[model samples]
Target: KQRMAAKELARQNMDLGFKLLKKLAFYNPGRNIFLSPLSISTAFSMLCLGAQDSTLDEIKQGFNFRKMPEKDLHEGFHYIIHELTQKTQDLKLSIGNTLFIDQRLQPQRKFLEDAKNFYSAETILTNFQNLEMAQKQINDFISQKTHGKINNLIENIDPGTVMLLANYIFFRARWKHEFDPNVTKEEDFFLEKNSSVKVPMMFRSGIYQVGYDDKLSCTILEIPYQKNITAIFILPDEGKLKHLEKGLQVDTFSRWKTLLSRRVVDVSVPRLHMTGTFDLKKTLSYIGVSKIFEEHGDLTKIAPHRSLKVGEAVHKAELKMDERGTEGAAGTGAQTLPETPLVVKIDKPYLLLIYSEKIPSVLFLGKIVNPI
Candidate 1:
C-alpha cells in the first residue's frame, strides 16, 4: 500500500516536472535549461510542513496534491527518498535538504523533528546577520553534498531573510550499454537553418526501446543507466519543439511508454555538459505559489514569529555526460537480428529526462540546445 502511494506521488511530481519544464523553456527560450523536479519539490514540500492557511493550500495546489491528504504526501516523499538512496548499488545518487534558519528564531520542535524523519533533512541555525558566514556555510554544504560539482549556489544573502531552504541532488551512473569512445566523432549540431556548431557525438548500436510520436512530431529514445535508471531523450522535428512542449503532460509520457517497443537501433547523442540556477520565487509564483513569498504569508507553524515567510527559494543543478562513465550493468546471447537498424540521430536541440524506475520519479529535467 505504501509503495502504491509513493508511485502516485511520483506521477504527481512528474506532472509538476512537465509544467515547470515548459515554463522554464518559455523563460529561457533557445538556451540550455536544466532543473531538478525532485530537488525543487522537496524544498517546497518541506516548506509545507511549516505553512498554514492559504499558504499551505496553495502549495498543495501547485503540486497537484490538493485532493490527497497532507500526511500521505509527506510519507510518499519519505518512501521515495529512502528507496532511491538505500536500494541502489551501482547508482550513486544523493539528495540534500538543509534549512538554514536565523539563529534568533527558534523553529517549532515538531517541524524540525519531522523534517529530519521524513526528508532526511538537517536543520541548521545560522547567524544570517553574518551574511558572508551564512552564505559560505550553505554553499559549502551544497558543494560537499554534490561532491564539488555545484559551487557558489548562493551569491548573496537577503538582509530580511530569516530562513533559506537549500536542496540539491547529485547523480553519477554509467550506461548499461556503454558508448565506445573510439566511435565518438565531431558532428554538426544544427541550431537553426544555416547555423550549426561542431559537437562530439557518442554513438552506440543495440536493441533499444524507441518511439516516434506522430502527433507531437518527436522521437523518443530510452537510454539505460546503471541500476533501474533511464534517460529519456526527446528530439522534436525541426519546428515542432513548441508543439511537443505544449502537448507534454503526465498522460503523454505514459502513452509514450506504452507505444514504445524494442528494436535494433543506432543511436547518436551529444556528450552534454550543462549547469543551471533558478530563483524559484518567481517561478513558483507562476504556479500559484505566490502567497508564500508575500508579506502576509502564513508560516507561523514554523515558529512563533508572526512575520515569518520564505525569503528565497533557489535551486542549482549540474549534469555531465561523456562516452566513458562516471567511474560507477547486463546482456545475453544475440539471436536473430535485423540486417539494417533504425537510425535515430539527435543532431538538433532536444529535451532530456533522468528518471529512476524503481523510485518512479524524475531526478532531473533539462533542455540542451547546445552541448558546449
Candidate 2:
C-alpha cells in the first residue's frame, strides 16, 4: 500500500510539473527555462498543511489532487520524499525545505512539528526587520545546500515579511555509460532556423531505452544516471514543437515508458551547467494559488491569533552534467551491440526531464533552447 501510494503521488507530481512547465514555457518563448516541479510542489504541499477552506482548495487544485483527502495527500508526499531521499542509494540527490519566520511572528507548534515530519523542513527564526541580514541568511543557506552553485538567490527581501518558505534540490550522479571527453567536440546547436551557437557536444553509444512517439512527433531518448535515475530528452520534429508541448501529460509519459525498449543507440548531448531561480508566489499564483500570498488569506492554522501568510516563497535549483557521472566512476561494463545503432542527435531546442525511476517522479524539468 505504501509503495502504491508513493507511485500515485509521483504521478500527480509529474502532472503538476507539466502544468507548471506549460505556464512557464508560455511566458518564456524561445528562452531557456529550468525549474524543479518536485521542489516547488513539495514546498506547496508543506503549505497545504497550514491552509484552510478556499486557500487549501486552491493548492489542492494546483496539485491536481482535488479528489484525494488531505491526510492521504500529505502521506503520499511523505512517502515519496522518504523513498527518494532514504531508499535511493546510488545517486547524490538531495531535497530540502525550510521555513524562515520573522522572530516576532509566533507559529503554531503543531504546524512546525508537522512541517518537519511531513516535509523534512527545518524551521529557522529570522529577523526580517533586518532586511539585509535576512537576505544574506537565506542566500547563505541555499548556497551551502547547493554547494555554492546557487548564490544570492534572493536579491531583495520585504522588510514587512512574516514568513518565507524556501525549497532547494541538488543532484549529481555518474552516467551508467560515460561519455568520453576525448570524443566531445564543438558542434553547432541550432536555436532557430538561422541562429545557432557552438557547444561542446558529448557523445556515447550503448544499449539504451529508446522510443519514438509519432503522434507527438518527438524522439524520446533516455540516458541512465547511475542506479534508478535517468535523464529523458524529448526532441520534437522541426514543426511539431507546439504539438508536443500541448500533448505533454502524465498519460503521455506513461505511454512513452511503455513504448521504450532496449536498443543499441548513439546519443549526442551538450554538456550542461544550468541554474534556475523562480518567484514562487508569482508563478504559483498564475495557477490559482494566490490566497497564501495575500495578508487576508486564511492561514489561521499556522497562527490563529495573527494573520499568517506567506510573504516570500522562492525556489532555486542548479545542476551540472558532463562526461563524468560521479567522481572517478567507471562505466557499466561494455554491452554487445549490432554493427549499426539508431542515431539520435539533440541539436535543436528540446525538452529535458531528469527522472527518478525508483519514485517514478520527474525530479527536474527544463527546456534547452540554447546550450551555450
Candidate 3:
C-alpha cells in the first residue's frame, strides 16, 4: 500500500510539472509558446540522478516529487519511458536524454549503472577542452535523435563545463479522422482584431468532446490522434486569453475534462508546423530549482569530488498537423453543438495540448498566436 501511494504521488508530480511548465512558457501573448512537459520532466529527472541532499530535494520539490523514495522515483521513470514510447504504424515517438561528460572526470559507477539500467540513457564521453567541437558534437547528436527537426541546440560549449544534460523528442502521428484536402482553403487567421493573415485551413466533421468554462470564457475541445495520443484545444472568447491562461491549473484541467461532452461538430483548424527551443535554467529557477545553479550544488554522486553545476540544459521539438493521417502529421475535430451539429472555427489565437491519454502528463503545450 505504501509503495502504491508513492507511485500515485509520482504521477501527481508529473501532472503538476505540466502546470508549472505552462505558467513559465505560455504567459506571453506576443509569442507562440511550444514545449513538451514529458521531455522537460525527463531531463530534470535525469539531473536528479546526480543530485543529492538539498540539491535533490529542491529539484524534486520543484516538480512535486517530494514523496517518492529515491529508488522508486528513478525506477518508475524508467518503466514509463521504456514502456510507453514504442512506435506503431500510426505513430512514431521518441523521448531521449543523454549525458555528455567531459573527458577528465571519472563518473561514479553506481550513477552510471543506475542511469543505464533504468533510463536506457546513452552516454557520450567527449573532450569539452575544445569548446567548438564539443558544441557541434552536442548539436549533431540532437539533430540525429530528432531527425533534423531540432538543430543548433548548444551555441557554444563552455570549456569549464563538466557535463551537459540534453533532452529532445521526435513525435510523428496521424489523426484517425482525416480532413479533406479538397475542402481546405485560405482563411483569415486573426493575430489581433485588426491584424490577420491568410492560412491554409483544414476542415472536418466528427463527434468530439467539448465544454465551456464560464469563468474563463473559453471553449475546450479534445481530439484524438492514433493510438493513445490526444490534443486538447482551448479557445478563448475574443481577448479573454490572458484570463483563461491565468487559470491554467491542474484542477482547471480536471474540471474541463469532466465537463466536456461528446457532440457532432464541424471543426476548422490551420495547417501549421512549429519548432521551438528553450534554455531551461532561468525558467526552471522561477519554479524552484535555483540552488542547483550555485557553487554548493550537491551532485557528488555523478563525479568524484569535483564541484559541479549545471552549465546548460536544453530542449527542442517540432510539430506539424495537416489533412491526412498518412504519416508525420494529423488534424483535429471539435466539441459542443446542437443536434444539427455546431461549428467551431478556430480563427484566432488559442492554446493546444498534445498528450498520450494513458499517462496523466501532457506531452506538448503551445499557444498559436499566429498559425502561419
Candidate 4:
C-alpha cells in the first residue's frame, strides 16, 4: 500500500506538471522541449515546506494539493521523496535541491527540520558579496549531483537577495533490448509535412506493447529498458500536435494503461539529446502562485528576520536515447515467439516519457518535434 499510494501521488503531480507544461508550451512556441515534471514539482513542493499561511496554501493549490488533507499531503510528499531517491540499480536517477542563503542569518529550526526531513535537501550558507565564487559553488554542486551531465545551473547571484533555490534531475539507464548500432542510418526526419532534416535513426525489431488513442489520433508504443524502466512514445497523426497536447488531462492518463497492449513491432527512434531550462516562477504564477514574488510573501518560517521572497526558480534537465548494451533475454526469447510485428517509425515529431513500471511515475517527459 505504501508503494501504491506513493505512485498515486506522483501521478497527481505529473498531471499538475502537464498543466504547467501546457502553459510553458506557448512560451517556447513550436520547438522541441525536454522537461522533467518530477523535478519541477519537487522543487516547489520543497519550497512550500518553509512557506507559512496563505503563501503555503497558494503554493499547495498551484500544485493541486489543496484538496488533499494536510497530513496526507505532507506525508505524500515525504513518502514520494523517499521512494524516488532510494538507490536503484536499473536506473541512475538523481534529484538534487540546494538553497544558497546569506551567510549572516541562520535559518529557523522548523524550516530546516521539515525541508531536510521531507526532501533530503541541502542548505548552503554563502556570502552573496562574493558573487563569483557563490555562483561557482552552485554550479559545482549541480555537476556533482548530475554526474557531470549538467553544469552552470545558476549564472549569477542576486546581490540584494538573501535566498535562491535551484533543483535539477539527471538520469542514465540502459535498454532491456538494445538497438543495433549497425542499422542506425541517416534518415529523413520530418519537421513539417515537407520540411525535413537528416538524423541518425536507430532501429530495432521485437515483441513490445503498443496502443492507439482514437480520440487523439495517435499511436503509442512502450520501449522498455532493463528492469522497470520504460519509455512511451506518443506519435500524433501528422497534424494533431496541438489537439493531442490540449487533450492531456488528469483522467486521460488512466485510460492509457487500458489502451495499451502487447504487439510485435519494429521501433525506429532517433538517437536524441535534448535539454531545457525554465524560470518556474513564471510557470507557477500562471496557476496563482504569484504571491511568492511579492514583498508580502510570508516566508517567516524560513528565517525570522530576513526579508526572503522567492527571487528566481531554476530547473535544468537532460534526456538522451542512443544505441547501447548488447543482446539479452529480450532478444532470444522473443525470436522464438510466433507473433507478427508492426513498424513504429518515430521519424517525425512525437512525445516521449521515461516512466517507472514499479512505481507508476514519470521521471522524464519531452517532445521531439525536430530531431537532428
* TM-score of each model, paired residue for residue: 0.93, 0.91, 0.88, 0.90
Which run of 10 residues does model 2 get worst, by summed lDDT?
329-338
The best-first sequence of candidates by lDDT reads 1, 2, 4, 3
Please list the residue runs of candidate 3 whose C-alpha ends up more than 4 Å from where it truly belongs after superposition. Answer: 1-22, 25-27, 325-338
lDDT tens digits, residues 58-93, model 2? 888888878676677777877777777732555766
Over 1-372, each residue of candidate 3 has an lDDT whose tens digit, in order, gives 133433453355546645554556454437777667667666677777777888888888887677667777777777667655757778887765677766677788988887777677788887777878877887777777777766676775666777776666667777878788999999999988998999999888999988888988998888788778787888999988777766666467667878799998898888877766666666776677777776674877876677777665555556777887422221110000006788888999898877667655566777788886
- Lowest lDDT sum, 10 consecutive residues, model 1, at 329-338
| Angstrom error at residue 158, model 2 | 1.9
Q: TM-score of the candidate numbered 3?
A: 0.88
Off by over 4 Å in 1: 86-88, 326-338
- Give per-residue CA lDDT, model 1, range 27-90, as digits (tens): 7688888878887777778778888889888889988877678778889898888788733666
* lDDT (Cα, 0-100) at 140 in candidate 2: 86
User: Residue 248 lDDT in model 4?
Assistant: 89
Clashes of each: 0, 4, 0, 0
lDDT of 4 by residue, 1-372 (tens): 443446667768778867776777766668877777777676777677777788887877888776666566556766765665634776665565666667676778877777777667678787767879777876777677776666777765667666666666666678888888888999989888878899999998888889889988899898888776688888999888888888988877778889988887888888887777666666677788877766663777777776667665566666667897211100000000004679888988898777767666677778778865
